Design a protein around this ligand. Structure first.
Ligand code: K
Ligand code: K
Lengths: 306, 306
């Protein structure tokens, strides 16, 4: 049946993307009801970016400083405010294509779909994980800022990411839709180090379950382990600790397959210690960690969105 | 920066997906204007599937044998015809969300986005390649049939694939939207072997260029090669021949990077012979072959879709 990096359908988000311009900067905004959300660094000039006082930069701004274009339609800005690192432009028109939505702060490990946009227009869609160091390994270019990450549950878009910057290492950083950065990052052009990145253990386990559902059973072994003994081995290979909450979320998959989580953990332990011996799991020679337990179920069970 | 399996935005295709039921079988249909396209095997019972006479099975069908549901709206079937292996159901309502579209027959190695659907509702979107043996390595479950593959150019959806079946090996086969199978496959439950699958060489090269654009240069070596000497090594590793046309299509990327195609070929030759020495290219320990030269440009240049 197969297994792919599978993104949510993008239709609901496509109709919310607009172009926002201020000064010398154009980037993307999210148009929901009569508000457009975008990164507040759009108000900065190059020189402002080095040490911006945003409260003061925004006071000196007027509604007429902001050009918002939805397709070939100018939206008139009739108000502006700042929530943390997000700019909220109140416009004269509610988006008639506003979907059901919420703003959610995700945790490291968790995944989301990215609708990469330039000039308010979608370029493509791909699946991403919030890395344990609060960066994402996206595919983004100049002008991508304001592009959002999202999950869909039924008909409800949960927006969890807005793109703000690329770090020097070529990885990406941003906020929830309430404007709070994931990670120790600030929207200021000043050197800022990403933490060291670790592997998302719960996701590697989820993917091993995916492999079992798709037939691959060679890595299942006769050994077992305790959670603590597993985490001790994990730590040494730069894997995130496995928590009881992780074990619980892997429940549905353990039930579906009949293999218990601690059994799978022992299977992973061996994989970490010995390697794969030039074998592949779901076409991969590396252990893949950008699929959550929910992602595997959704794909392996055929969950749909309406 | 960054490089991902990036799918086209799915919005334009989402609004064309419907549920088609006949007998006890439910699968997906593509609703364009007042026609719904779906696999004709929807008219077969399990017993019919072993040796179907489609002309005769269809004569014995009436419009009222087909239930089409678009969301919670029943579309009334008022006509039916068969074009090769695709069923065309004429319905009472033109799709108000019909996009600009064409039907295109793609070639092996070319890529496309898949909107996996169940019960006329989208589950997810992912990027696919037409394998050299005319199969696709999709992620599809029971009820996925009628799901389509597509590219977008500007505002125009080019439909290139409709899903019909999974082979025993777990790979997938289907038709263009005129109903002609890609490959030597038939919509009959009778043993059908996929040809031996080879690696899409031009795509591996395109991806190596992507890797260079993103920094990775460790695999660039001091050697060069002729096209023929390359193809001799390629053949031995189950790689498709590299043609002059392939060399020409890689031109833009060779220009962008400054590395000539035959130089990159030599870099690949060594990778094939020695392996990767536990190193990775764009996060991968395997050579990836599901990105075309165009795909790399689009993603690395930031092409957008109206
Ligand atoms: K600016
Ligand atoms: K070389």
């Amino acid at each position: 049946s197969g297994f792919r990096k599978m993104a949510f359908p993008s239709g609901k988000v496509e109709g919310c993307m607009v172009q926002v311009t201020c000064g010398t900067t154009t980037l993307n905004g999210l148009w929901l009801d009569d508000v457009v959300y975008c990164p507040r660094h759009v108000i900065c000039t190059s020189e402002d970016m080095l040490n911006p006082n945003y409260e003061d930069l925004l006071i000196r701004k007027s509604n007429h400083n902001f050009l918002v274009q939805a397709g070939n339609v100018q939206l008139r800005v009739i108000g502006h405010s700042m929530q943390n690192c997000v700019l909220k432009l109140k416009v004269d028109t509610a988006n008639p294509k506003t979907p059901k939505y919420k703003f959610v702060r995700i945790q490291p490990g968790q995944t989301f779909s990215v609708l990469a946009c330039y000039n308010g227009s979608p370029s493509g869609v791909y699946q991403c994980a919030m890395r344990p160091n609060f960066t994402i390994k996206g595919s983004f270019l100049n002008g991508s800022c304001g592009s959002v990450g999202f999950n869909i549950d039924y008909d409800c878009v949960s927006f969890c990411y807005m793109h703000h910057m690329e770090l020097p290492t070529g990885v990406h950083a941003g906020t929830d839709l309430e404007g709070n950065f994931y990670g120790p990052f600030v929207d200021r052009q000043t050197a800022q180090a990403a933490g060291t990145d670790t592997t998302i253990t719960v996701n590697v386990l989820a993917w091993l379950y995916a492999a079992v559902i798709n037939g691959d059973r060679w890595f299942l072994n006769r050994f077992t382990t305790t959670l603590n003994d597993f985490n001790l081995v994990a730590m040494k290979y730069n894997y995130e600790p496995l928590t009881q909450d992780h074990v619980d979320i892997l429940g549905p998959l353990s039930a579906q397959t009949g293999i218990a989580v601690l059994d799978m953990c022992a299977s992973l332990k061996e994989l970490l210690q010995n390697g794969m011996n030039g074998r592949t799991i779901l076409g991969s020679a590396l252990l893949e960690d950008e699929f959550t337990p929910f992602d595997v179920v959704r794909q392996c069970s055929g969950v749909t969105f309406q």
